[PDB]
Each structure stands twice: as C-alpha cells, then as structure tokens.
Amino acid sequence: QLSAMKERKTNYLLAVKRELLSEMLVIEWMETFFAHLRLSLSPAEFLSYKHKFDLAAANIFGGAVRVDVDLDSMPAWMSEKFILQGSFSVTTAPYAV
Amino acid sequence: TTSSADRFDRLRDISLKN
Amino acid sequence: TPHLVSAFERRTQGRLLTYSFVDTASLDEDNSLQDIARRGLKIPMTGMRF
Amino acid sequence: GAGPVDAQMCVAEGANLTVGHVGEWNMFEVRVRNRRGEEVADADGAVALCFSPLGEPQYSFVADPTSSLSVDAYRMDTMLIGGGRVGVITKTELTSLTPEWAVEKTEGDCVYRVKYRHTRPGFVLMHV
Amino acid sequence: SQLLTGERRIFEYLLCQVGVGRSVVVEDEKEACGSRFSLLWEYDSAYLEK
Amino acid sequence: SQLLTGERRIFEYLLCQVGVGRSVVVEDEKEACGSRFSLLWEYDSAYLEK
Known part of the structure; x- marks a missing residue:
C-alpha cells in the first residue's frame, strides 16, 4: 500500500523532473552539435551558421519555460504527510466469548 | 569535447529508474 | 488552422513543446495530407509515435 | 454550419451522467456543436473517458480479523470496506481504476453513443 | 569505385x-498501445524507453 | 530433525x-502477459516456449 501511495506522488514529481531534464537534453544537444561546428567549418561557414544558431535558439527556445512548479500547479495530492501507527503482538491467549 | 560531454551522457537516459 | 493553434494552446499549459518530424509515407490512409490541412493530425485510440 | 467543432460547446446528455450502476452497462450521449452551435453532422473525432480517483488515502490491516469481528479489513484488497467506497483511496483505486468504455459513433448523425461499466462502487471523476 | x-x-x-x-x-x-495502458489525466504521453 | x-x-x-x-x-x-499481447480472435490461448 505504501508503495502505491508513494508512486502516487513520486511518479508525478520525477515526471516533471524528467520534463525539465528533456529540456536539458536538447540544451545539451544544442552544445555538442555546435562544438562539432567550430572544429569543422570554414571561416565563412562560421558566421552563416552562428546567425542560424541565434535564430534557432530564439525560435525553438525563445518562449517562457512551461515547466512551472512551486506547490500549486501540482494538485492537492502533493500536500499530505503519511503516518502509520499501530502495534503487532503475538499472544497465547483464549478467545473470550 | 568542448564542455558538455560528461553531463550530456549522464542525462541521456532520462528514465529515472535510480 | 487558427482552430488548431487555439486548441493546441489550451491543451498544453504546463508541458514542453518538442519539435518532432513526421514522414508522409508513415501516415496511414486516414491521415492523408489533404485531410491534415482541414482538421489536423488525428491520433486514433491506439496512438501514434513521435 | 460544420467547420470547427468546439469542445467547450459540446454537450453531454443522458440519464446516467451522475448515477451509475455497478455491473450494468450505463449509457450517455455526447453531442458535438461548433463555435456558435449548429449540430455539426460531419464531426468525425474521438471521445475518451479517462477516470480519476477522489478522496483521501485510507487503509486498515487488523491482524486476525475474526476475533475482533472487523469486517472492515477481512479482505486485504479492501473489498469489504465501509460505506460506499467514498473518500477511500487504497491501491485498488490508484493502480487499476479501469471501467471499460466504448464509443459507437454513427456515419453522419450527430450523437456519440458511450457505454461504460465498472466492478467497484465509489465516487470518481469522469473526464469526458 | x-x-x-x-x-x-x-x-x-x-x-x-x-x-x-x-x-x-x-x-x-x-x-503502449492505448487500449492496454489507459493513462490518467495527469500523465499525458508515454516514453518508449527500450 | x-x-x-x-x-x-x-x-x-x-x-x-x-x-x-x-x-x-x-x-x-x-x-506473454495481457498488457501487451493481442490474442487475435482466431486464437483463444497462448502456448509458451522456453
């Protein structure tokens, strides 16, 4: 049960962690690509593809980041604090009708 | 090479089964 | 279509907007390119990969 | 006056929108209208009914549920739970929650015929 | 050649x-074929890992 | 003992x-579990190999 209540929250929180990490993955794929541009292009090609690099990051990534997270875009499910009290005990006792 | 690298390959696997 | 861009904005409010490429031959007989200009890419109940 | 089929003007009509019977097929109709509303006949689309649970997470185990006469937690998946399964979110509400639903759109009329049934009682949200 | x-x-x-x-x-x-997964209203897509 | x-x-x-x-x-x-297997209507059972 506690794993089901855990994955009620943590499957949502690492979904938005994954959501912004997919953004870092395309941010990184921006950088590893252009690192290969600099080592390979002609000096004329660098200016033509740097301006296209400017316009690429201003049109794939120019808008505000839509991964908004403070406490409220989350539903009310992520405000609970589970507790679990009780006591198990083994007894050699009769049944006391 | 040229920065990135070691941080690119660690978050390539975005499935966070860690 | 302006209808398509308004419905897309309402659906995605806190999600990314990734840019996927879709081949024209991978689309089935339902999603003909004549039909896409009128209503958009209709995803059935099975679903389509991007 | 066909054209676009605005979702926010589509209407749901029927007798089993707010009342459901377990183990029996429950029918309701989905009608499609445009921006001003003129009963778009050629409105080929898809209607889905993803369900969400509602309530607070509750449980009980009770070791040896026969001596204490605790019928509340005799069965470990909380089938013998208390009143109406309302406000109770166990793992059965969380991982399965699949009432099978089917849509039977006709070939030029403007009604979507939707039927659904469930195995459990409770208090859920139907995202039509 | x-x-x-x-x-x-x-x-x-x-x-x-x-x-x-x-x-x-x-x-x-x-x-991940629609008729066998049935996502909730929170989650909105399926990441094909392998 | x-x-x-x-x-x-x-x-x-x-x-x-x-x-x-x-x-x-x-x-x-x-x-072979039912979450991915189709069971085409000609068949109604699934024999298992190794």
Whole structure:
C-alpha cells in the first residue's frame, strides 16, 4: 500500500523532473552539435551558421519555460504527510466469548 | 569535447529508474 | 488552422513543446495530407509515435 | 454550419451522467456543436473517458480479523470496506481504476453513443 | 569505385509541434498501445524507453 | 530433525478443465502477459516456449 501511495506522488514529481531534464537534453544537444561546428567549418561557414544558431535558439527556445512548479500547479495530492501507527503482538491467549 | 560531454551522457537516459 | 493553434494552446499549459518530424509515407490512409490541412493530425485510440 | 467543432460547446446528455450502476452497462450521449452551435453532422473525432480517483488515502490491516469481528479489513484488497467506497483511496483505486468504455459513433448523425461499466462502487471523476 | 548520386529524394515531412508532458516511463511499443495502458489525466504521453 | 525428513505439508489445489484450443506458441511470459499481447480472435490461448 505504501508503495502505491508513494508512486502516487513520486511518479508525478520525477515526471516533471524528467520534463525539465528533456529540456536539458536538447540544451545539451544544442552544445555538442555546435562544438562539432567550430572544429569543422570554414571561416565563412562560421558566421552563416552562428546567425542560424541565434535564430534557432530564439525560435525553438525563445518562449517562457512551461515547466512551472512551486506547490500549486501540482494538485492537492502533493500536500499530505503519511503516518502509520499501530502495534503487532503475538499472544497465547483464549478467545473470550 | 568542448564542455558538455560528461553531463550530456549522464542525462541521456532520462528514465529515472535510480 | 487558427482552430488548431487555439486548441493546441489550451491543451498544453504546463508541458514542453518538442519539435518532432513526421514522414508522409508513415501516415496511414486516414491521415492523408489533404485531410491534415482541414482538421489536423488525428491520433486514433491506439496512438501514434513521435 | 460544420467547420470547427468546439469542445467547450459540446454537450453531454443522458440519464446516467451522475448515477451509475455497478455491473450494468450505463449509457450517455455526447453531442458535438461548433463555435456558435449548429449540430455539426460531419464531426468525425474521438471521445475518451479517462477516470480519476477522489478522496483521501485510507487503509486498515487488523491482524486476525475474526476475533475482533472487523469486517472492515477481512479482505486485504479492501473489498469489504465501509460505506460506499467514498473518500477511500487504497491501491485498488490508484493502480487499476479501469471501467471499460466504448464509443459507437454513427456515419453522419450527430450523437456519440458511450457505454461504460465498472466492478467497484465509489465516487470518481469522469473526464469526458 | 562508384560516383554516388545517391538517388536524391522527395522527402515530404510535417514539422509537428508535439506537446508531450509528465510522461510515464514505458517499455517497448507493444504495451503502449492505448487500449492496454489507459493513462490518467495527469500523465499525458508515454516514453518508449527500450 | 524436521525438514530433513520433510514432514507432511498438505496442499489445496483446483483440478480445472481449461479449454485451450488452437494455441499460438510465443516465448517467455514477460511478453506473454495481457498488457501487451493481442490474442487475435482466431486464437483463444497462448502456448509458451522456453
């Protein structure tokens, strides 16, 4: 049960962690690509593809980041604090009708 | 090479089964 | 279509907007390119990969 | 006056929108209208009914549920739970929650015929 | 050994702004097929891992 | 002195007649589960390989 209540929250929180990490993955794929541009292009090609690099990051990534997270875009499910009290005990006792 | 690298390959696997 | 861009904005409010490429031959007989200009890419109940 | 089929003007009509019977097929109709509303006949689309649970997470185990006469937690998946399964979110509400639903759109009329049934009682949200 | 024209082509693509969000990690395509997964209203896409 | 002799532990089983007819051979149960397997309507059972 506690794993089901855990994955009620943590499957949502690492979904938005994954959501912004997919953004870092395309941010990184921006950088590893252009690192290969600099080592390979002609000096004329660098200016033509740097301006296209400017316009690429201003049109794939120019808008505000839509991964908004403070406490409220989350539903009310992520405000609970589970507790679990009780006591198990083994007894050699009769049944006391 | 040229920065990135070691941080690119660690978050390539975005499935966070860690 | 302006209808398509308004419905897309309402659906995605806190999600990314990734840019996927879709081949024209991978689309089935339902999603003909004549039909896409009128209503958009209709995803059935099975679903389509991007 | 066909054209676009605005979702926010589509209407749901029927007798089993707010009342459901377990183990029996429950029918309701989905009608499609445009921006001003003129009963778009050629409105080929898809209607889905993803369900969400509602309530607070509750449980009980009770070791040896026969001596204490605790019928509340005799069965470990909380089938013998208390009143109406309302406000109770166990793992059965969380991982399965699949009432099978089917849509039977006709070939030029403007009604979507939707039927659904469930195995459990409770208090859920139907995202039509 | 061979000059390569390489049969240059008629690539017709659709740049679809696919808005995915709060994706659940899923195995290969055979189980992410719509009629057998049935996502919640929070999660909105399926990440095909393998 | 008990588990070496293996003292009687007695079982409760169900002898049930299963109507397996025209099975399809398919490999290990990890992909023979109903969350991904289709079971085309010509068939109504799934034989398992290694």
